[PDB]
Amino acid sequence: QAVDETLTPWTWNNNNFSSLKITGENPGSFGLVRSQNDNLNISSVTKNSSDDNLKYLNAVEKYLDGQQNFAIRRYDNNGRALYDINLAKMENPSTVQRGLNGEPIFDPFKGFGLTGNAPTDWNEIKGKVPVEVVQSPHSPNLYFVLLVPKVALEYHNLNNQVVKESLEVKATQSSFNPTQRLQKDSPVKDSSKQGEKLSETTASSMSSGMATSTRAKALKVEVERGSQSDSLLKNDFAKKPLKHKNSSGEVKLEAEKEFTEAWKPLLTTDQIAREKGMGATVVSFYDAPYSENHTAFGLVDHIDPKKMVENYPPSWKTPKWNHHGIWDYNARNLLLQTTGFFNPRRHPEWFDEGQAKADNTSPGFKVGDTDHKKDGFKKNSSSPIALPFEAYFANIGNMVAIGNSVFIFGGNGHATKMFTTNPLSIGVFRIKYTDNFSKSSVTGWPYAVLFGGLINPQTNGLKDLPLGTNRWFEYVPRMAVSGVKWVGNQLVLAGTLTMGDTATVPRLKYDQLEKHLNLVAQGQGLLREDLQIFTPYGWANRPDIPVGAWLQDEMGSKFGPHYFLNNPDIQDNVNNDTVEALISSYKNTDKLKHVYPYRYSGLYAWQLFNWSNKLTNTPLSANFVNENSYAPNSLFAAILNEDLLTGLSDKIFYGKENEFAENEADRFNQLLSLNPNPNTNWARYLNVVQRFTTGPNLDSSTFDQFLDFLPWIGNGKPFSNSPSSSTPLPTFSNINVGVKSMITQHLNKENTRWVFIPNFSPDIWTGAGYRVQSANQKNGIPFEQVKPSNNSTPFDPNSDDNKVTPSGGSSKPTTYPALPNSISPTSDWINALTFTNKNNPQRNQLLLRSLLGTIPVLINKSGDSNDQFNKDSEQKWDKTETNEGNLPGFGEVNGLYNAALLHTYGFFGTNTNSTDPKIGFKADSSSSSSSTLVGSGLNWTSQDVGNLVVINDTSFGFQLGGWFITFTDFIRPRTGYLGITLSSLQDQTIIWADQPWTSFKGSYLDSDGTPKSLWDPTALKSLPNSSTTYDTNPTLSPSFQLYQPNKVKAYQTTNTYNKLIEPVDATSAATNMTSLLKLLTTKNIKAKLGKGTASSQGNNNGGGVSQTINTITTTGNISEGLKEETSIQAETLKKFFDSKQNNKSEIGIGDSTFTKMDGKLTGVVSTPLVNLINGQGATSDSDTEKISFKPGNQIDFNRLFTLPVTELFDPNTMFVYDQYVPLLVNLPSGFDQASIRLKVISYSVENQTLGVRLEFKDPQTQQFIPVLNASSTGPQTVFQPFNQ
Amino acid sequence: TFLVKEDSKNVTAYTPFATPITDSKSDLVSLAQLDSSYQIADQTIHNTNLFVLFKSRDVKVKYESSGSNNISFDSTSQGEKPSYVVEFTNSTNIGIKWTMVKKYQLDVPNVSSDMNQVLKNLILEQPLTKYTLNSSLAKEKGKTQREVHLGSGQANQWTSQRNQHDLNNNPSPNASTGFKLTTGNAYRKLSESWPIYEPIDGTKQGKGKDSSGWSSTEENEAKNDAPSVSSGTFNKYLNTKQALESIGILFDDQTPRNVITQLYYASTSKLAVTNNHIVVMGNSFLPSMWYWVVERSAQENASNKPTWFANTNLDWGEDKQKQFVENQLGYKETTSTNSHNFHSKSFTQPAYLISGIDSVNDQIIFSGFKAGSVGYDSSSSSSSSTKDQALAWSTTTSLDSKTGYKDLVTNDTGLNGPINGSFSIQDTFSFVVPYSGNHTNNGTTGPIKTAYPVKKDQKSTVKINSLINATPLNSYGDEGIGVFDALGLNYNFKSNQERLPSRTDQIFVYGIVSPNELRSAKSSADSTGSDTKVNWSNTQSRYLPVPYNYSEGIIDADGFKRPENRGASVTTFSGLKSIAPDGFANSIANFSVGLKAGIDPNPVMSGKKANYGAVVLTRGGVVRLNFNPGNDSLLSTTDNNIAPISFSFTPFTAAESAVDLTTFKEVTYNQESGLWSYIFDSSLKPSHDGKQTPVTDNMGFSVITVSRTGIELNQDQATTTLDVAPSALAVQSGIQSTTQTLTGVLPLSEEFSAV
């Protein structure tokens, strides 16, 4: 029962909890503690070949019950421990006895009444470790605590052949080649099935029009239900004239021939529900620090996985399928990509069978039969979304209490995250209490049905992020959660969030998979990366064209209007007269649809905008959702609607309004919104968010200008490049990059004076890799960029396919006379939303991954012998019109500039190391060339998010890897303020570690008014083995990826970027590039940058504390960089930043302050007066030493108790009258008698006994405190007339 | 003490225990000595006095082109049953029994000479129906600008010939001039009668304004295709008799009564009260040109006459917006012999689909959609180029207009005439004209001119007259621009994207009217002979299109348009497909109902009057009207760029959109709570479908909770001046049922309510 000093306070990685600050009637701390003993040999528990995970996990839990102890001790408001609470070892525990009104029976000096018997489920609960604690908002002395199996901590220490990665490194004995895991051969036309292709429209309706055209007519798509039971009469979306390659048998997604040692969860969602020892548990309990019966239990609830999985939407029973079905399914399977919306090929963490169901077959629907009319009907399902062990504990942690209920928002995932596997919080649980806390109920729901009410008006940051959904919840939001807290009157949630997939939205032309390996690998689950990768030349004209149209021009000699190569230079002018001929004739019905003769193409932002799940003005407004992100790729914070969260039902009911279409004829007229069938309640849940935020209160190109301002944590230098003509150029923004171009000759020459800029002269910086005839012709470019299919001569303007006859026969050409000056992935075009490559999703993805410091770079050359790339006489920043400026323009990370990113990282030149590492990229013109991506050398990842801490009534922030981030203005916005402030870590011994977040020991608000964070350079861990006996060219680690070869033709020596750089077969390329394939392992990047060993020097240990920069009402004011009156907002913000590169602290950007401490850092314990590191540094209550209760021999009882005790206090508030305070409490001379009084806590008039607690004005805070030293029994005492 | 409408004639006070009071059921229609044919329309409580609006189904109004008493009740067949507003006071020893106090009879307007000239040739589109189709709405494209101006067979001469036509620099010769009236929805004169059949397709079916043509054979053919209870094929027409009856059109056996009678009986719809005035306006379903203003001191036996909305010079926010609205009414210098129209006789917008009427703090607040009214030709012969054609055009702001709301709305684009059509921008299309003012493909060439689509050589031989639409859609042209305008799809390509306000289509009218200008309105109503105008200063108008999410194919709204959006299946009204779940059969025509002003109960700064904001329902979202109680005027901010603060549109979700708007029964405001409530009575649904199938879901009720949100005015020293419009928030409250017949909701208390 009493305190044991052998248990030491600690922080759990999954929630970063260490202690709860108790407040109200008796303040103090609860905090987690564990046994300090080393030599924990978990590998002594044998795993055989003939047994399953469950009896192994029970043997590990039983073994760890011998090797380790855990508890939640209470401390006073000065940091001093009271009682132990080792839940596995406490003697004769009990639940609390109740009155007939359900109230717990209580009297403060006696404590609670105990029933004399333990709670339910006590034999299986007692082994679990407590990991989070919270206090009731409305009920006194009432608390909740969360318990989990010991493997929810120790999972990282269990043996690697059961706790596998989602990928394997192998022996690499054939030499390493990352294409060996990739299905890569392209599909082909079926030599026996050509005749079923979509028909050309033989006659087209006049509609009383007059214009005419010679171009090939629209394709029909006919679909109708017919009279047969399980066949339509027509179903033209189901047509399938293509088939796969037969390279040593058929190429298709087929798990049983590919995953020979398939990854699967530790336990299934059904096992965790039935095996009561393996589920998480929340219990209510009661505590009183100075009673005889000081602690006892309330109620026990299991956080049952079936109460989450039976609350998933109907579409989550068929995650292999989506509401477009058959045509999308076939286009995906032909391109060798995932089908559905949340399939286990990308997201196995939520599936009971993991990689064993990572295939396109058996989608819950009839598909693949010999007749196109037979496909597209509902059937039985065998691979639904679940909640298996790894995802389950990431869905646990981050508690809050509201009314007669308590919630669980889930963790950051560091209960169960591995290097290649991403368990995350997918929803929220609730426990609700009934009959005055005599009874309970437990439930939970996924974030998809909660966040679906999000809209563009609900954020002061960027618009159009991929956070939208529809009547089918195929957008699946999940978070690494920082926490949930009260920010003054408003309840707030924070963390990092998954968007929809921004990267794989563009889709390949059917034959070209052999030359675009990264885009297919990123679609295959092989490249688990969410950053957008530039690949434009191999994309089809349109992602959504039905596959029966793809064969309409195999030669390319007609530039087949319905299906062709994506390039924007060669597409229609459809003017005042033209639309009535080429497209407005094809009217259609309840059983007919069409594909139109319009030529269509665009760059990455066109593809992304067209088929990503962007937010709009309306909610439920995303009828296309390409896929879901592998890991969190956004910051997040939001205001959560606490009374609506209190008022939502436990059970969620869906119906036929959330089912996918049962047949394709009902899919043909598919309503995007429909009435809930009024017994159902699913649509109520959408309104739990009032407001949200994602980054700075900035808009358009201004957000890219902010991206350049922050320092890179690998070296402390800004991405801006302006603090030092042959000088280098920035990576994210476009200001001062290339040349000032007059846009007055852009468009079809159509209208470009006062249109796009706040000033008389329309000057725009054209960016890197731009196209011009000459420096004298820097304004626009004329049409000359024609592309053949073979050597087959020009695109042929003024030909009959490029003409129409209008009313009165006055024919004219349907093509552009002039074009935009740039296509490069760095492009910013205010005037051209289809040639711009920057986008609002990418602006937020770049913000997060440049904070985490792990944006990759594109390479041709390593630092090795004869391989080297140079700073001098090999790069020309002033000549970005030609190959000597070394812009890749293919395989590059979107929105940014690679050579500038390489320079800011210091991969070439003396920027980051004492000698030139000579790693980089060069655009050669003499021969074909090969390329691949590599990491920055840093190891942080987007799940590395720590405690949400609330600073005051409107300001809050959190730790995020090497940063602390603050959302200072989100609750009460202002004009001219950026709304975010940031502090960087400084310690290179943390920043260059191989799993760096394991050194963070928790974050807290401190008594001097600053948030602070704990760090320990001794807490880092190596990789699972030392590579044993061989060089592991692939080394699985938290910043590794299987980046594929991209191969390309020679760059032109002049006019280099006037056309896109042409790709070639990459399937054999890996043998030509071995020096780059070795640099895929991030340890070799550290070795070549000089960071890989003790060569970093500095502190040998030096653990301790970190603190955010000082702040005032002026901090983050940028009102002179906002607005416009003489130029464009990003350009004046660039002028405003360039005088301030030496003085970033007034912008709210800079390095943290830091202080060292000796020994281990394990965790804080916190209370309203003080914070104690490791629980050391406790105090004598030095402000209150002179204050004490009078002892029983100093009281003359009949002087007090001649009057009944009924009138010694005010009945409306229970404080004792002022004159009787010095009659019961000793106080020093000259003391302020108004600063202290006594509160009655229990009494009985028939015994004349009065029980009291004292309250005093804290010198530090505008609030009352107890005086802890006031007696040998603490702040509580009793007085009675000699009758005790 | 909760007075609840027991039926169409009985109102009874319910105790807070949700129990009727003994001997409290009262027959108000008989209590007011009005025959049983009367019924109660709307009731309000003001100083614990219950007022009632009585509208009878026996009323019959006749219109005569000749004479003075042009609009008068048809007393020949005992049809002189004008509508009454009756003040009822509880006058006893504290037991609920109402009594006559005053009884004001609302009389038909007196038509001046100018209004007479306008109404003689005026024609009203048949009312919007619950079961109405996009295709139904759709009207075949009219003569293009070049066809109207230069004539036929004048191609490639635009450039040359445009100068003398005061159309200089005009970049769209193929710009629609309107919609042909030869087909579509039935356009009938006031003295005529609407049909019960709505054409499925308004490009092919229906005979439009040709009443003689419709009645000759097309009426019989439509009757054959669409019978009245099925046996009908329903391939060209829909028999919407049941829906016409439901939304309040009077019927003689089967044929509806005359249009003047229908308009009057619709105008007797709602009731807002003041300590000195009582105002009555029309319902939301079909327009209402005239609204009665009642002087509470007027004699019991005296006559109360309304004011023509045409005589109410509303302030649309900008003189430029007002002239936009004015210029589409019709040609100005008609001078044929009598071919006068609304614009020619100098009258403003004549028809509003009044969403609702309410009062607070002695101030009256009104809101509603601007009902489209435009000129049309009635030459009947050679013949006019524009013969049998509506003269309307979309007025969307151009792509290069200066960023900012003010600039947007003030943009000269379509000042006088048509300029929009089809255009190409980079890798996408913009139906909006890319240029305005003096902007072109080679520089600056001079101002862009626009003119009314009427040939000048025929200035004396073109007979132009006005019409009134049944919906906000001013221009019915089966065209892309039209659809875009309807759906709110028009966007600029600049750095900061903006929705292009269609200054003359889907316009949303709202404001607060003060007692002085109400007295001015009453004086206008009293005016005899010369017609006198009414000035409403504290009013505003906002382009409020239907959400694009209600139309199949349109996924999002942005400057970049997906190429498939150019297809005829989304370019035209007729090709458009509706996925509207709010009980409407259409997804083009917006519709508003249920304005209820309320006092903000939250504390306010001392010396500052308490906030009162009004909430109005629309298609796919709520609208909050923000007012400055310090001046009792619309909330406004100094920075022009900012959208008028007075306006705030918050979209709905699946639960709110599912709530039929055709079933709005009553709206109650909880004064101490500060939360609205929108009672929807499913029972209001028509008996039979538009295809004569029985309605299977006529049972149930639902409510929507409208709660204030955002940052309010005069909250604290720091919130004395505002920049962000307070925004409402609608949530499906949780009071829903399908098996029950609603009788009334009781705002029992803060924490409780009864059903």
CA diameter of chain B: 86
Look up residue B94 and give its two tokens: 């504290």
Closest CA to A308 of A152, A396, A427, A194: A427
Q: Which residues contact B745 (CB under 8 A, 6 or more apart)?
A: B668, B677, B679, B703, B735, B753, B754, B755
Closest CA to B423 of B403, B400, B402: B400
What's the sign of the alpha-carbon dihedral A49, A51, A52, A57? Answer: negative
- Partners of A129 in the β-ladder: A148
Q: Cβ contact (<8 Å) for A810 and B727?
A: no
Q: Which residues contact A550 (CB under 8 A, 6 or more apart)?
A: A241, A242, A510, A540, A563
Q: Residues before each break in chain A (C–N > 2.5 Å)?
A: 724
DSSP element (H, E) containing B571: helix B568-571
Closest CA to A310 of A453, A445, A148, A480: A445
- Asked if A131 and A146 touch (Cβ cutoff 8 Å), the reply is yes
What is the phi/psi pair of residue A1199, to 5°?
-65, -35
Q: Please state, in angstroms and as integers, the Cα–Cα distance from residue B49 to each residue in A213, A1220, B3, following that order.
A: 72, 59, 11
Place of tokens 């080429």: A582
CA–CA dist A616, A464 (Å, integer):
6
- Asked if A488 and A971 touch (Cβ cutoff 8 Å), the reply is yes
CA–CA dist A177, B18 (Å, integer):
78
Say how many residues make up chain B: 755
- Partners of B103 in the β-ladder: B86
What is the phi/psi pair of residue B136, to 5°?
-60, -50
Q: Which of A675, A745, A830 to mutate to test the interface with B (most CBs of B within 10 A)?
A: A675
Residues of A within 8 A of B549 (CB-CB) are: 616, 618, 620-621, 672-673
Look up residue B175 and give its two tokens: 């710009």
What's the sign of the alpha-carbon dihedral B17, B20, B21, B27? Answer: positive
DSSP secondary structure, A1144-1210, as one string: GGGGTEEEPEEEE-SS----EEEETTEEEETT------TTSTT-EEPPGGG--HHHHHTS-GGGSB-
- Asked if A465 and A471 touch (Cβ cutoff 8 Å), the reply is no
CA–CA dist A927, A923 (Å, integer):
10
What is the phi/psi pair of residue A1082, to 5°?
-65, -25
Q: Cβ contact (<8 Å) for A834 and B428?
A: yes
Q: Which residue of B has its CA nearest to A571?
A: B427
Q: Which residues contact A237 (CB under 8 A, 6 or more apart)?
A: A221, A223, A325, A326, A327, A376, A546, A664
Helix, strand, coil percentages, rounded to 5, for chain A: 15, 20, 60
- Asked if A934 and A857 touch (Cβ cutoff 8 Å), the reply is yes
Q: Which residue of A has its CA nearest to B204?
A: A207
Q: Strand, coil or helix: what is A255?
A: helix
CA–CA dist B226, B238 (Å, integer):
6
Among the partner residues B427, B549, B736, nearest to A606 by beta-carbon distance: B427
Look up residue A254 and give its two tokens: 């087929």
CA–CA dist B289, B111 (Å, integer):
12
- Strand extents, DSSP E, A596-710: 634-640, 689-693
- In angstroms, this model's resolution equals 18.0
Q: Please state, in angstroms and as integers, the Cα–Cα distance from residue A1037 to each residue in A521, A522, A532, following that order.
A: 19, 18, 21
CA–CA dist A689, A484 (Å, integer):
13
Q: Which residues contact B153 (CB under 8 A, 6 or more apart)?
A: A808
Q: How many CB pairs under 8 A join A and B?
A: 205
Look up residue A347 and give its two tokens: 């997201």
CA–CA dist A633, A941 (Å, integer):
10
- β-strands B197-199, A490-497 pairing: unpaired
DSSP element (H, E) containing A703: helix A702-707
Count Cβ atoms below 10 Å from residue B750 Cβ, excluding itself: 10
- Asked if A745 and A821 touch (Cβ cutoff 8 Å), the reply is no
Among the partner residues B424, B439, B574, nearest to A573 by beta-carbon distance: B424
- Strand extents, DSSP E, B563-653: 593-599, 612-618, 621-625, 627-628, 633-634, 649-651
CA–CA dist A307, A281 (Å, integer):
13
What radius of gyration do chain B's Cα atoms show? 25
| Range B229-241 burial, b when 16+ CB lie within 10 A, else e | eeebebebbbbbb
Q: Please state, in angstroms and as integers, the Cα–Cα distance from residue B678 to each residue in A172, A477, A1236, B266, following that order.
A: 70, 33, 54, 21
Residues of B within 8 A of A672 (CB-CB) are: 549, 552, 555, 579
CA–CA dist B291, B73 (Å, integer):
17
Among the partner residues A602, A617, A675, nearest to B658 by beta-carbon distance: A675
To the nearest whole angstrom, how far is the Cα of A662 from the nearest Cα of chain B?
19
Residues of B within 8 A of A602 (CB-CB) are: 427
Residues of A within 8 A of B429 (CB-CB) are: 574
Q: What is the DSSP letter of A1045?
A: P
Q: Cβ contact (<8 Å) for B737 and A678?
A: yes
Q: Strand, coil or helix: what is A491?
A: strand
- Asked if A418 and A488 touch (Cβ cutoff 8 Å), the reply is no
- Asked if A472 and A660 touch (Cβ cutoff 8 Å), the reply is yes
Helix, strand, coil percentages, rounded to 5, for chain B: 15, 25, 55
CA–CA dist A955, A296 (Å, integer):
37
Q: Strand, coil or helix: what is A361?
A: coil
What is the phi/psi pair of residue A948, to 5°?
-65, 120
CA–CA dist A497, A447 (Å, integer):
11
CA–CA dist A161, A532 (Å, integer):
33
- Asked if B267 and B229 touch (Cβ cutoff 8 Å), the reply is no
What is the dihedral angle through the alpha carbons of B201, B207, B209, B214, rounded to the nearest 10 degrees?
A: -140
What is the dihedral angle through the alpha carbons of B309, B310, B314, B318, rounded to the nearest 10 degrees?
A: 150
Q: How was this entry determined?
A: cryo-EM
DSSP element (H, E) containing A765: strand A763-765
Q: Which residue of A has its CA nearest to B203?
A: A207
- Asked if A506 and A546 touch (Cβ cutoff 8 Å), the reply is no
Q: Cβ contact (<8 Å) for A617 and B550?
A: no
- β-strands A111-112, A1153-1156 pairing: unpaired
Among the partner residues B174, B427, B700, nearest to A602 by beta-carbon distance: B427
Say how many residues make up chain A: 1284
Q: Cβ contact (<8 Å) for B494 and A573?
A: no
Q: Please state, in angstroms and as integers, the Cα–Cα distance from residue B63 to each residue in A1161, B288, B527, B529, following that order.
A: 93, 16, 20, 18
- Asked if B243 and B256 touch (Cβ cutoff 8 Å), the reply is no
- Partners of A1244 in the β-ladder: A1249
- Asked if A467 and A613 touch (Cβ cutoff 8 Å), the reply is yes
CA–CA dist A302, A280 (Å, integer):
6
Look up residue B593 and give its two tokens: 């109902």
Q: Which residues contact B696 (CB under 8 A, 6 or more apart)?
A: none
Residues of B within 8 A of A700 (CB-CB) are: 495-496
- Asked if A83 and A1 touch (Cβ cutoff 8 Å), the reply is yes
Q: Strand, coil or helix: what is B309?
A: helix
Residues of A within 8 A of B140 (CB-CB) are: 208
Q: Which residue of A has its CA nearest to B560?
A: A833
Distance of CA A47 to the CA centre of its chain: 35
Q: Which ranges of A926-1017 does DSSP label H, i.e. alpha helix?
A: 988-991
Q: Strand, coil or helix: what is B262?
A: helix
Q: Cβ contact (<8 Å) for B567 and A620?
A: no
CA–CA dist B81, B35 (Å, integer):
9
